[PDB]
């Protein structure tokens, strides 16, 4: 997921070199990646799809509490307990 602000959390663009083999031997890393995709990634993707389908059945929201601005200790008079508490 990418549920965060890219400007707040910057990340330079990702440059991945293309695979250019120079030998006839097979790639064990590639074969193991295929095996991992077949055995792990697909089942976890199916499970996540089911879970997210269940979540969308009942969708509810929560909010970010906004706090008003109040006068600060510079404007507070001396021995004024309420203003001092707010500040």
Partner 1 sequence: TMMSGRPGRVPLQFLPNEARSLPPPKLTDPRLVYMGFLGYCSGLIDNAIRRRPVVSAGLHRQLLYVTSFVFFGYYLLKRQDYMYALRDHDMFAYVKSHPEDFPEKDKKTYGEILEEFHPVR
Q: Which residues bind partner 1 (CB under 8 A)?
A: 73-80
CB of 68 to partner 1, least distance (A): 21
Residue 28 CA to residue 35 CA, distance in Å, equals 10
User: Is the Cβ of residue 2 or residue 77 nearer to partner 1 in the bound state?
Assistant: 77
Residue with Cβ nearer partner 1 (2 or 78): 78
Comparing CA positions, the residue from 38, 41, 48, 58 lying closest to residue 1 is 48
Shortest Å distance, C-beta 83 to partner 1: 9
Chain centroid offset of residue 69 CA:
30
Q: Is 33 in contact with 19 (CB distance < 8 Å)?
A: no
Kindly state the smallest distance separating residue 70's Cβ from partner 1, in Å: 15
Shorter beta-carbon distance to partner 1: residue 69 or 79:
79
For residues 83 and 69, is the Cβ–Cβ distance under 8 A? Answer: no
């Amino acid at each position: 997921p990418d549920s965060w602000d890219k400007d707040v959390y910057p990340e330079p663009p990702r440059r991945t070199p293309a695979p250019a083999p120079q030998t006839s031997l097979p790639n064990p890393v590639t074969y193991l990646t295929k095996i991992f995709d077949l055995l792990v990634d697909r089942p976890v993707t199916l499970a996540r799809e089911f879970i997210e389908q269940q979540h969308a059945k009942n969708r509810y929201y929560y909010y970010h509490r906004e706090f008003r601005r109040v006068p600060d200790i510079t404007e507070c008079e001396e021995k004024d307990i309420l203003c001092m508490f707010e500040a």
